[PDB]
Amino acid sequence: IRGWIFGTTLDSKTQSLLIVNNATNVVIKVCEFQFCNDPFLDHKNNKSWMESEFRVYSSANNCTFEYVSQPFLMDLEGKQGNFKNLREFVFKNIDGYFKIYSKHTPIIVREPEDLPQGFSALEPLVDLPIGINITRFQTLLA
Amino acid sequence: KVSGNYNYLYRLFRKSNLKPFERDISTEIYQAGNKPCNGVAGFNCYFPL
């Protein structure tokens, strides 16, 4: 799981938001993205994944906001089970500001899913002045 | 400009309020009267700018 897309219609007629952590840097682009109907970065060789299909937006038209920051710490390679990593994010859009808060806790093991009983507060990560309204969000993956 | 400065635009067809501090680019032709227009520059189908 790498990024997210936010919008209200997502058909190159309303302003759209994209966030990607897959690249070497964290990239946030508020643009008039024309997402094609196949938002996948995973279909690759028989057991490996690459950074292919990096143009899932078929058109990047007249648009405004761009931002690059340092990457966030993920793990390496692919494993089955032993998911030590656990990631939490909260996204809000209030008073014309897009607020993203983040938290990452490693070293969790249990046989069932659906989170433990943990008391973990969330630190503020970024506040952005995107200045749009959003109605539907779709997760991205690689 | 005495010769005509049309570069400044404004919106007057939304039928919706706004929260503080956002911009909206609605290039699509607004429809009023609850009848599907599906056309361009028609009656009761006005350009929003």
Ligand SMILES: *[C@@H]1O[C@H](CO)[C@@H](O)[C@H](O)[C@H]1NC(C)=O
């Ligand atoms: C971007 O500029 C082109 C150039 O004419 C214009 O046709 C288009 O409407 C503009 N789009 C936005 C969102 O400003």
